[PDB]
Amino acid sequence: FNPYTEFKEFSRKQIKDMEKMFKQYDAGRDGFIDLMELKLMMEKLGAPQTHLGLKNMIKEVDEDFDSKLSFREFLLIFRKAAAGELQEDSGLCVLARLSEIDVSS
Ligand SMILES: [Ca+2]
Numbered sequence: 001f002n003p004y005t006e007f008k009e010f011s012r013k014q015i016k017d018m019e020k021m022f023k024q025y026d027a028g029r030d031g032f033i034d035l036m037e038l039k040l041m042m043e044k045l046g047a048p049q050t051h052l053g054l055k056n057m058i059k060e061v062d063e064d065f066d067s068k069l070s071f072r073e074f075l076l077i078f079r080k081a082a083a084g085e086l087q088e089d090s091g092l093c094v095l096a097r098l099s100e101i102d103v104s105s
């Protein structure tokens with residue numbers, strides 16, 4: 001997986017920032033963000049989401065159906081944000097917003 005070739009709508013700086021955020025919250029260092037890790041992320045961003053909200057966030061981008069997020073799937077959150085596909089103030093909209101990445105730039 002070369003993210004730089006799949007996600008050309010983002011600069012190298014933006015992808016590296018997304019990587020830093022991903023790695024920050026992958027507490028277990030296994031290369032994925034699972035439900036509890038995402039729960040902790042949203043708490044720390046200051047916008048805790050409900051259990052179902054969290055589950056639904058993962059479902060929106062969980063392209064290989066394993067119920068956790070790889071880095072590529074994490075980038076899909078930002079791709080969806082940038083494509084105008086996220087519902088206003090849904091959990092993923094909030095994640096992208098509160099993150100240091102502004103996909104509208
Ligand atoms: Ca993990």
Ligand SMILES: [Ca+2]
Binds near residue numbers: 062
């Ligand atoms: Ca997955």
